[PDB]
Design a protein around this ligand. Structure first.
Ligand SMILES: CCNC(=O)N1CCN(C(C)=O)CC1
Length: 119
């Protein structure tokens, strides 16, 4: 991550772009496992092995409250969604697959966002 990712405070116009990124991932056909927090009745050990859970609804709450001060911090929470999934699930599970797909989409949208920031 370069000069501007780490450093640059997020402005109000930057926040309009982060909302748009987040809604694109929420609309993706492969987002379904990540839309809301993991239900412990589906995976009763999940919260004993994943130390820092994340999901897209918590990220939306944080975006609305202006939680994030730098782009790096938003990227960090998104990345955790995907890393948590690939650590918990085996490499041949549909959940692991979805993480693969959705992370590649995220990177495409994040590059779009960075390009838009300064011009
Ligand atoms: C839908 C229920 N199926 C499950 O076994 N899981 C596994 C853990 N998980 C994620 C997102 O990592 C979702 C819940």
């Amino acid at each position: 991550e370069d000069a501007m990712t780490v450093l640059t405070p997020l402005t109000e116009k930057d926040y309009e772009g982060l909302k748009r990124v987040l809604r694109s991932l929420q609309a993706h056909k492969m987002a379904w496992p990540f839309l809301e927090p993991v239900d412990p009745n589906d995976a009763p050990d999940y919260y004993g092995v994943i130390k820092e859970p994340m999901d897209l609804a918590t990220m939306e709450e944080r975006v609305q409250r202006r939680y994030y001060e730098k782009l790096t911090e938003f990227v960090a929470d998104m990345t955790k969604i995907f890393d948590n999934c690939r650590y918990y699930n085996p490499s041949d599970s549909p959940f692991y697959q979805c993480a693969e797909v959705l992370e590649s989409f995220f990177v495409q949208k994040l590059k779009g966002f960075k390009a838009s920031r300064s011009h």
